[PDB]
């Protein structure tokens, strides 16, 4: 039974368990629909993440700057979702957001040139125009395992295997038939993210150590 208080001062006695979109809804359709994610406590979490205890809540929308930082990450998902369509045996490794966009690097055969690099930002217009909704599951070290494992992901495998403690609780996105893996936030749907673009290519060694694979990093920028 959550007591939801708002900047404003406003405060929402609720007697089960409720999402920072739920409280978007119950304020008007405008802020619902423009709800990215929300601050929990102090704490970013998704828009679909429950509030179970008393807590001070906002709404985070892409007026704020962490509204732009996360269509961005998602943006780096939406890459994933992309290039895992255009070639399948893509290996995942770390696609996080910089300075004024994000990058992915990826394990893949084929030595991606100007007209692929074309082709994969066509092909991520195409999926994030679907305005399809990102669904978002919480789950054990060992069911995030067992999910990049089925899907062949090894870099995703090592992430799990060296460096998240096995108490920790994994966020996966699903991106219709993709699935990524983050803290997050992540945008709720990819209505959020049709301003991209996709810029230039470099290489880059994965975990930064020579003796390691040579992978592919693939930058891009996104906007509100």
Same mark, same amino acid.
């Given at each position: ?36 994610? #929300? ?7 998704? !828009?679909?993440? @429950?509030?179970?205890?008393?807590? %001070? &809540?906002?709404?985070? /929308?892409?007026?704020?700057?962490? #509204? ?7 943006? !780096?998902?939406? @890459?994933?979702?992309?290039?895992? %369509? &255009?070639?399948?045996? /893509? ?16 394990? @893949?055969?084929?030595?991606?040139? %100007? ?110």
């Amino acid at each position: 039974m959550p007591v939801i208080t708002l900047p404003d001062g406003s405060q929402r006695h609720y007697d089960h368990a409720v999402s920072p979109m739920d409280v978007a809804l119950d304020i008007g359709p405008g802020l619902a629909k423009a709800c990215i994610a #929300g601050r929990v406590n102090g704490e970013l979490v998704d !828009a679909c993440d @429950l509030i179970e205890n008393d807590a %001070q &809540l906002s709404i985070i /929308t892409a007026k704020d700057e962490e #509204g732009l930082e996360i269509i961005r990450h998602s943006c !780096a998902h939406l @890459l994933g979702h992309a290039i895992k %369509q &255009l070639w399948p045996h /893509t290996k995942m490794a770390i696609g996080p957001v910089i300075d004024n966009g994000f990058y992915y690097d990826v394990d @893949l055969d084929r030595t991606l040139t %100007q007209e692929d690099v074309e082709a994969l930002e066509k092909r991520m217009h195409e999926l994030a125009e679907k305005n399809y909704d990102v669904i978002k599951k919480k789950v054990s070290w060992h069911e995030a395992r067992e999910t990049f494992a089925n899907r062949g992901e090894s870099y995703k495998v090592s992430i799990l295997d060296e460096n998240i403690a096995h108490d920790d609780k994994p966020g996966l996105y699903f991106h219709e038939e993709y699935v990524d893996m983050c803290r997050g936030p992540h945008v709720p749907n990819m209505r959020f993210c049709h301003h991209f673009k996709l810029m230039k290519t470099a290489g880059a060694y994965w975990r930064g150590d020579s003796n390691n694979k040579m992978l592919q990093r693939i930058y891009g920028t996104a906007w509100a």
